[PDB]
Design a protein around this ligand. Structure first.
Ligand SMILES: *[C@@H]1O[C@H](CO[C@@H]2O[C@@H](C)[C@@H](O)[C@@H](O)[C@@H]2O)[C@@H](O[C@@H]2O[C@H](CO)[C@@H](O[C@@H]3O[C@H](CO[C@H]4O[C@H](CO)[C@@H](O)[C@H](O)[C@@H]4O[C@@H]4O[C@H](CO)[C@@H](O)[C@H](O)[C@H]4NC(C)=O)[C@@H](O)[C@H](O[C@H]4O[C@H](CO)[C@@H](O)[C@H](O)[C@@H]4O[C@@H]4O[C@H](CO)[C@@H](O)[C@H](O)[C@H]4NC(C)=O)[C@@H]3O)[C@H](O)[C@H]2NC(C)=O)[C@H](O)[C@H]1NC(C)=O
Ligand SMILES: *[C@@H]1O[C@H](CO[C@@H]2O[C@@H](C)[C@@H](O)[C@@H](O)[C@@H]2O)[C@@H](O[C@@H]2O[C@H](CO)[C@@H](O[C@@H]3O[C@H](CO[C@H]4O[C@H](CO)[C@@H](O)[C@H](O)[C@@H]4O[C@@H]4O[C@H](CO)[C@@H](O)[C@H](O)[C@H]4NC(C)=O)[C@@H](O)[C@H](O[C@H]4O[C@H](CO)[C@@H](O)[C@H](O)[C@@H]4O[C@@H]4O[C@H](CO)[C@@H](O)[C@H](O)[C@H]4NC(C)=O)[C@@H]3O)[C@H](O)[C@H]2NC(C)=O)[C@H](O)[C@H]1NC(C)=O
Lengths: 208, 208
């Protein structure tokens, strides 16, 4: 029969008030013989009615895919409420339940430090700007770089690493042309995490 | 039936000539029912009889786990020789074969940079010393911290991260008491990788 997959909002969506976090209930392997699918949604066990269900869609394997999207309140998700998708279909003897909620654990505020390139890297035509983010908990986090308030794309970020104290750390590396670093351009490492005041903090880095 | 997992030598073992690297063939889910397991090993497809099978061990789940280890020559591993473990068990209709060799791809020399603590971190009573190693290929690498010859306790190293150019980078974070840093003690990041000269380099960091 059909299977159900329940997706969480992205961290950044729950941590920025102007964004809209959603959880997504995807239903695959629905048959032509039993194509009707019903969604029921619950927040902490209370039925909720404002989900948006798109009409079913083809799939090249002759099964249907159907998705229901539930907008969540930023505060509900961050406060650990449980989101349940129920999904009914005639091929099933019993409707399928999936539940999802934010990672548990006592939250711990990231500390964020920017580190300029080693002097030894100064020969090269590109140099590395490092943002260390440490001491955070829930591992869920967003780290981004900008300059002139616009995104700097050329970075990579390590996964969270469990530290000796049970918190997480990571590093992000932004690679820039040496000239930009030498012209005194200011670069900024932005971190969004639930344990941050207003869920955000920024540290800047420039030639000293 | 049983499952088999074939593991490579530790990079520190392949890269230091005084050490002896081994490939490890482990068989789990071996039944009491039919407990016999035979091992045939091959390097570049020719059989060796140089391997050592360890005596079976009953686990907490009642199954047996059975380990064969094959010593490899450093140059054979580094020159890309292929090692095959063939495992035969009565509960197998046919032997399970696993082959392993070192990661393919043109070797690229790590650039190793030490980064001192951010000034903002001086308000803590411990500080972070950062070792950035980038531009390396095979991701296989060993990175260690020490001071005055002695290995440092409190450090953690991210896994290798695939960079935009197809090389890897990582960071290693060493945590020390601020006083040690401000005392003027010298700390050293040691890196072992196939594409380094003598497979080894070390870079120091201290307060000026
Ligand atoms: C018929 O077709 C459909 C449609 O797709 C295709 O159509 C054509 C064009 C071809 O391309 C074909 O590929 C195919 O026909 C098929 O539908 C697929 O069905 C499979 C299962 O059979 C689903 O696999 C699951 O994938 C999810 C992750 O899915 C996200 O990422 C995918 C890319 O990796 C992406 O394709 C998906 O769309 C989805 O994308 C995300 O979607 C959300 C919502 O919109 C979005 O917000 C995100 O940003 C987006 N992210 C992206 C892009 O990455 C994966 O999580 C599932 O793994 C779980 O379940 C497995 C069991 O199958 C199990 O092996 C894993 O362990 C894992 O199990 C979970 O384990 C964790 C931890 O252990 C646990 O917490 C969970 O509870 C547990 N859950 C379990 C057990 O279920 C899973 O692999 C595809 O998503 C789905 N594709 C689409 C587009 O819907 C269908 O299979 C075909 N039917 C046939 C051939 O019979
Ligand atoms: C009964 O118990 C036994 C023993 O387990 C133990 O039992 C008691 C004591 C409990 O307390 C348990 O806590 C304890 O674990 C069970 O045996 C286990 O079986 C599972 C699978 O069922 C194995 O999982 C695999 O693990 C390997 C990695 O294993 C290394 O890392 C483990 C921790 O991460 C570590 O504990 C293992 O010992 C091993 O550690 C390494 O060991 C070597 C050799 O000594 C050493 O050199 C290293 O230093 C050391 N490393 C570390 C970390 O110390 C993992 O790779 C496997 O993933 C493969 O298989 C999956 C599919 O089966 C697949 O999803 C993965 O992608 C990957 O699959 C492979 O993928 C590649 C490409 O990516 C491909 O080339 C391969 O062909 C492909 N294979 C397949 C099949 O597709 C997997 O996660 C455990 O290792 C094993 N535990 C031990 C200790 O042996 C047994 O399962 C139990 N019986 C039952 C029925 O329940």
């Amino acid at each position: 029969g059909p299977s159900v997959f329940l997706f969480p909002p992205k961290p950044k969506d729950t941590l920025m008030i102007s964004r809209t976090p959603e959880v997504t209930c995807v239903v695959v392997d629905v048959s032509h013989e039993d194509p009707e699918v019903k969604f029921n949604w619950y927040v902490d066990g209370v039925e909720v009615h404002n989900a948006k269900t798109k009409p079913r869609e083809e799939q090249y394997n002759s099964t249907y895919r159907v998705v229901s999207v539930l907008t969540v309140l930023h505060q509900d998700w961050l406060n650990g409420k449980e989101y349940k998708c129920k999904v009914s279909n005639k091929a099933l003897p019993a409707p399928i339940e999936k539940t999802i909620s934010k990672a548990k654990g006592q939250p711990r505020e990231p500390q964020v430090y920017t580190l300029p390139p080693s002097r030894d890297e100064l020969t090269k035509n590109q140099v590395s700007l490092t943002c260390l983010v440490k001491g955070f908990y829930p591992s869920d986090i967003a780290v981004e770089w900008e300059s002139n308030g616009q995104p700097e794309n050329n970075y990579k970020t390590t996964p969270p690493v469990l530290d000796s104290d049970g918190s997480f750390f990571l590093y992000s590396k932004l690679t820039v042309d040496k000239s930009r670093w030498q012209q005194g351009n200011v670069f900024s490492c932005s971190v969004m995490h639930e344990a941050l005041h207003n869920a955000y903090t920024q540290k800047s880095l420039s030639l000293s």
